[model samples]
Target: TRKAVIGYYFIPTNQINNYTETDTSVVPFPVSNITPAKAKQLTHINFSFLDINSNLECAWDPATNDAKARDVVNRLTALKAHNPSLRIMFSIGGWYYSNDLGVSHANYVNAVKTPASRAKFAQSCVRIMKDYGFDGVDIDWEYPQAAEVDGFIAALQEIRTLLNQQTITDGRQALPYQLTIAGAGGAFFLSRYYSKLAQIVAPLDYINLMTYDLAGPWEKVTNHQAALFGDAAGPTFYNALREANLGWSWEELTRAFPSPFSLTVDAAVQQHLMMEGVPSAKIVMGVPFYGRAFKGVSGGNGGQYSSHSTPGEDPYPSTDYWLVGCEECVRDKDPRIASYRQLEQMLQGNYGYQRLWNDKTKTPYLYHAQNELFVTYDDAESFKYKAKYIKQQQLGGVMFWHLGQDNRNGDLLASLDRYFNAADYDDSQLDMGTGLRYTGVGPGNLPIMTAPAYVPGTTYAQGALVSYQGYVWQTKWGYITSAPGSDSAWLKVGRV
Candidate 1:
């Protein structure tokens, strides 16, 4: 069975913000609030970034930060208690907050220098987990340099040992203290650690790969910040309103992150982990619950990865909150781009924006010639594909950046839940005989083919009397494995 779905819950930054702004265009989601539906669908909830103090403690800074974090966890634990097989983890560190010299990174480095110190750090984690009423802890190191990678893996090994020991001695908790890490998802990080794949995999119960922000406003040839695959054409348009805003001739905007070309993610699982021998159970791919904007750029699709060109007299202002915080950075500095909520409203009627999709990558992008504005972010549609990708890839599950940033009704969250829980039978190895025109639509998608019995080379119908993958399946339709020796003629409808 698969491990389950993961949702990285970025609790609201402040308690004052609510999803009730009066725009009628973009609804707001108040700090740290969640719907009952979201609370139930996600099997694992990784609370975003609680900082590590100099003393190696995961405490909320009384003055700078509020108690809302701990408060939310208290609420989350209750949610877990009510739900079956749910795990809530304390996620420490994030990209900007855990930089090379950042306090959190420095603290992690300090903890891993010696064996006793490493064990002490592990003990600190256990104490904090117990003190704060958390089921487990997830170390988000943001990134580790080439030289520091070994230490990073070793520290985790020490921590996992302690977690296992503690779980055996403890009686109140129903599950073991899960020891996971939020690590870098790009090939750049892997080049440093892929050689020792098993050593890195040894300590953690799960590894959440941070896959967003691969491309931002920083570069000239722009592309989607996150995508499963790619192919593109550059086209231009004039944003008369935003200064004849801009134009792009459709020719160069297709690429994928984790793919290393469009910087897509397909290769992360396909080429590296699967080939390098890492267990699928240990990997959790990430998704963004928010959106990314490229401001003041010219041309259609905001000149997607289309550089080596020129813009007119005026230029559009640029805004990228990469290392910066969102609320303050999003509203004040930049005047272009929209959030998922904003796009939801923007796409409803006629908002002067034309949405374009790259079939190869399965990513949707928006371009407004009037403003020369372009936005590339994931939606319900994208998640449908991404869900199947994660499932087909035999990955642990999907993880999000901010749980609250999803739509008010939690449709995004619900859709992903359905995708993960829905039935999908595997037909990868089923032989269709020569000249038979049959292709599997998706691999690992839906759910396990939890059928009964195992019989091969039998002529069975679309009923419970079929066997494949060394198991019996209630074939939803067609020849099934009934023609295992000749042609599979397998058809499937549902499985859970």
Candidate 2:
């Protein structure tokens, strides 16, 4: 049961441009909020993030206050005294830094463009890790282009090798540093780097599946942000493209994007497993602690999948299916965004707000009839179902974006921590995508320790290890052409 309860802690000091020290009322979350006791509740806390410079070097964003950022790093690292097993990692790049939101300059493209630059990048990572007392490194490149796939993989490999060397040098070889990446959940974005999914993940201990942000201002109609399963009522790939009047027939669109056309967490995981051949153990599903709001929503169903009726609404014009939901649907230009803390305050205040639950997608939403603002987000109830899904799917674990979004009582994070850490949590829930699940232990209530005994004439794929004659044998690569004991392709790895 190697489950990780990971949380991203965004340092407030890094947002100096957006906030000032005296503006505590605007952004009240302080680094001190993550107390020693709170640190013990999480397995890993990835500090978000270390910005990149135009020189292809790792550095703090110019907008950040250097002294304050350093204090934050020291505070998070010191948490190890309270929980020695806890890992504090530095996350490099984020939505802003990666230019995914079209705000900051994109620097990752040149950082991994060449072997020399990749080496420098890897060295900078190790340097920062050691200097800041970080236990590991998490790369949040947002996305890499199709041409950058090889360089992305090579960069990871470079980083892994350097990290190993640094660990051995520090006499911590027994507990080597970890490497992870925040991977894309959207099928279209993921397909850009689908050429080498296995190779991309080989060096990573785990890949955080950023399954949130499924719906936002880019969408004309509102939908669940991180739904476990796809919603039939939501915008499907076929419907989105067909409605866009892209001059393509519906049948052609269907051929391009098949069933489960609606973007969802389940579909994303299945893409990594069934399509990309990534093991389920290394996938960490991400949930949002915050919510996206839409203004001037229309449609009587409490603004669920409702269109923005406000005139003069501006929307990004793009052919991307996720961006285009319904034809002639007005996109909200002034959608409000808030954390759970602010949302809690709004719900308590006399703002005429109502929290509604969508049983179909297992998510929650908030609607205000006075102003017609619809907010799609996850709460404690949604977290329970998601955590249960993670356990049932035997995934690496759960990851949420930023700890600061939690309410004053830390209800969101606490709920996830409790549900994910529940010893009674079982894998009984049916995997909607696969219709398969892991049953508990076999007869006698003992766990199965090894793979099934190897049988002659049986075919084995690449990177498969089988137990034979009380020893573990592994195939050198894909396509085992000979017997385990007699073939050169089979190599012994360990004792059974």
Candidate 3:
């Protein structure tokens, strides 16, 4: 099992709500309130953006000393000093930044293709990272399809090339760190174009899949945005990968489906990438810390929106959907947001929908008819199913969209900790000093190591091994290794 790699999106200081200072310096959130101690379990704290342009200028002004990038760096550096095990990565190119790329080849190419421009931008990023202490960089170029694909790929490669050159020529190891790309997780974005992009960026670290917002009031009937696998057009999920020309066969697709949670889908996708020659460790799983909601339904159906719904009309008459922003919904005492609390309360007791677990699919679903209400959500129970599947698959650990939306007292995080930690225990116990253990003896003419002829306590060395009937038998020595501490240990083996 891999140590769960949890990450939180920390937006830039300037973007922070209610920021009033004007010092033009970076201003981080109150670190003492969301201390590193509480966030030690997280693997990465993503500083959202530096937003440098071709002119090598940062997005926010610093005359007021309240600039987001600088403040973020200060906070991240402070956190890193306290928790050396935690990694801090700076993310570039968010929704706002995407506009700079322009809409056509002539526009973007002429604007971004210059070596000097690219180098300057990359250098600025490196400078900020080094100045503030970030472990890596992530490029969130939004949708790099159609006109922007070529330039986006070129920019990514240019950044990577510049970093690589810096590392070799200047021996600046920390200056050129891990590189990641963030992309949409739906069919339109995951198709051949993105696959080619993935091939190009395969040398980089991981691809962060934005796997939420599959369905909203934008349609008619309610459906989950991040379903692992089910109906086509159901949500923003792995099926999009398949539809995107990922070349997954039916059997491979079934395995990818991992049934209950997104982690299974994550592992399957990672495996697919590996089969295509992408390293397993380069894939990271994304989870959402927020939930979507629907409103204005009639009959007993809480008709949000479904894939089948047509545009304009209410496909499900009684249902009207609305976006309950995560930040707004989680404010318990805020009168403006108390409706979410009421909805949560309504979900308690017998009147609430009963969850159904599909072992074959490894997912949970529910249906309700009370008060003409029907709602389906990926609650804590559903999240647990996926987290366990992630551990079982031995893939990279999970990441959440935003930290603020998580139930602070643990709810979701606690379950993730339990699942990953349990897998760690099992993997650790399997390790013996000699790196060899007894699986079972072979039976019949199959060979001593072959079939049914089995014996308990029969030891075999590490490398010499084969799996039979759920037992792993060793045929040589030093085939397996183990590490100390919980499964969530930063340096644990078999992790990304």
Candidate 4:
């Protein structure tokens, strides 16, 4: 019953067949479009990438104008006043955060390691939160280098400590301020830091796993951006995580599977947090609303689980299995950003595109069987499976990248709302207007409070910690609906 929906409100998603460009800065898509109504459907909203400088200041440098920034910031802050229930956070550093995109060390690597610098960074975030009316901050530090693990935890601790200072009031009352972090969804780098990751996880509100792009421009395989489970691999996700030294306590968590070996987001969290004793509900799993592409592919399979090599970086030839799919993808040599809605118009305009499904993986893919081109991504069908799987895994909830990326109809967003609260809304419809979901007050151990026992309710306060659904969580809002391991309001700071 502890579940919620979180969406990233990102800028610059391609709206059409412009594979030629990666940045959507030229497009008319504005941040103002996200009205209060649209936000109501979501429990938390993560405003992504505050772009850091070497000095650790959040650069407010055209697309990131100081005035324009405040405009949206004020609007979002005002929206929080209206709802008094919704939670919003400022996210810093993403894959393309700065010069570190497609690199090992992150953009602010040096700053993160410096004590004064990291303290300044955390203080600045606290200033932004109070000034801009943000409920919290999310650290999208990308993947820290194998050697920078100590520094990564240092920055993490600094941010957590600064935020905690205001989590409670003079009366020791809880406030809604939250601290969150994002890490790889795959086992690639997670294994390297497994030993000390708990130090970082212990302080945040909840951990948001970058579940998509496991197979990206750097990868050589063609597969779902965030597969719930592996399909072609001989090992199921559990085996892979175990191999990567994920959670040594794997056996204590999941029942032995007679099923085939797979690598998926579901398995990723289960094992990633298992041996670490991180509760399932402490993790908000990520789902992709878009797709990834593989070019120069052959055969009808569309290059699923295939080996590929590309020359670019570290020194020579950057290695990756996945690339952006678009006509421009061939020219620019950088990955493409194809939004979910854009793909529909693409299917309408292009010819020779074939559609295929991976029932075992519970995913759908588009392919150019003739050209040997393939794009594997999430659709409504897969979202449904992931949502159901969310509860099955007893996770906090789910998150998707960039809200506006959804089709004009917003069916993708609507589907998530309905699936999590089928009785409150019509599952058959994707209309956001009709949904009236709010969990009923249960008469369980503490249902006498007459509020959403699990959904968005007044049972929890900001920064308050509680044990629910088997995990420890931090409330992002006074009237908490999303658990700590789930939405923006409740963050998973620990386990049972």
Each model's backbone clash number: 49, 0, 45, 31
Best candidate according to TM-score: 2
Q: Global CA lDDT of candidate 2, please? A: 0.72
Cα lDDT tens digits, model 3, 59-164, are 3333224554455456656776665567778776665665434322132333355666555556666666566566667776655554555555666676677557
What digit string (tens of lDDT, one per residue) describes model 1 on residues 299-324? 63444655422221113344343212
Flag regions of model 1 displaced more than 4 Å.
12-33, 62-69, 172-174, 232-260, 274-277, 300-303, 307-338, 423-496
The parts of candidate 3 lying over 4 Å away from their true place are: 1-4, 12-33, 52-69, 99-114, 146-151, 161-176, 231-275, 297-379, 391-394, 422-496
TM-scores of the candidates are 0.70, 0.75, 0.62, 0.69
Ranking by TM-score: 2, 1, 4, 3
Error of 3 at 391 (Å): 4.2
Clashes of 1: 49
State the weakest 10-residue window (summed lDDT) of model 4.
436-445
RMSD of each: 13.8, 9.9, 13.1, 13.4
Ranking by lDDT: 2, 4, 1, 3
TM-score of candidate 4 on Cα atoms, chains taken together: 0.69
lDDT, candidate 2, 57-87, per-residue tens: 7777776766666666777788888887789
lDDT of each: 0.59, 0.72, 0.47, 0.61
